[model samples]
Target: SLEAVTILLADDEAILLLDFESTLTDAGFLVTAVSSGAKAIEMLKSGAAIDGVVTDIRFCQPPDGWQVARVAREIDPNMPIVYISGHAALEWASNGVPDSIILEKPFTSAQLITAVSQLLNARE
Candidate 1:
């Protein structure tokens, strides 16, 4: 049997992070939710066995989703990334890592799941 995939999720918004975590958990993904880009970077640098990443663009500190994606790529070049943002979608082409997907805000949990699923599947 395939092991459950773990997703590193980062978003500064508490309620949104909780909602995404619950939804991803319900979808059978093991989610590690962090509220800040720094926390997300710390977790990634800690050598956690993360299978994918889902992150919001803007945060309260220096490293944002773009930086998170860069770190994840530096650690694992093939890592799947899904960027979520309300206003940063347009910047995705310039700021996102290659082959990563960007989902604009107001998207459904199903859409998020689909994007994650597709990226994970492509990796395999």
Candidate 2:
């Protein structure tokens, strides 16, 4: 018996963030979606909610995905994480964590759902 869990998704693009919301929710997982890296970090900064996190490298904002995931990494060491970046693949190369399941910018929902599910499963 698998209990339902919550996931936090971060992206600056409205449509893309909306798409990610539908993607994870379709896979039968709960999602707390955010349109900015700021909101993404806000959730974990207080450190209450969990399950996992997904983000893009550059959100064109003050905090990037590197720093966003960095908070989760520091707060929740065993947390599941996913990163999706377009031109900032090199940034991920330099600032990414211990294999945060970095997916390219144009990946399919199949790939995303699968990776998130994989990491989510691993967390248990």
User: Top lDDT: which candidate number?
Assistant: 1
User: How does each model score on TM-score?
Assistant: 0.95, 0.90
Give model 1's TM-score versus the native structure: 0.95
Q: Model 2, residue 94: displacement in angstroms?
A: 1.3
Per-residue lDDT of model 1, residues 35-124, tens digit only: 988999999999889999999899887888999999999999999999999875889978999999999978999999999999989985
Model 2 agreement with the true structure over 40-105: per-residue lDDT tens digits: 899888655678999888887679888888899888887888998886576666788885799986
Worst 10 residues of 1 by lDDT: 1-10
Every candidate's lDDT: 0.92, 0.84
lDDT for model 1, please: 0.92
Best by TM-score: 1
Candidate 2 accuracy as TM-score: 0.90
* Candidate 2: segments with Cα more than 4 A from true spot: 1-3
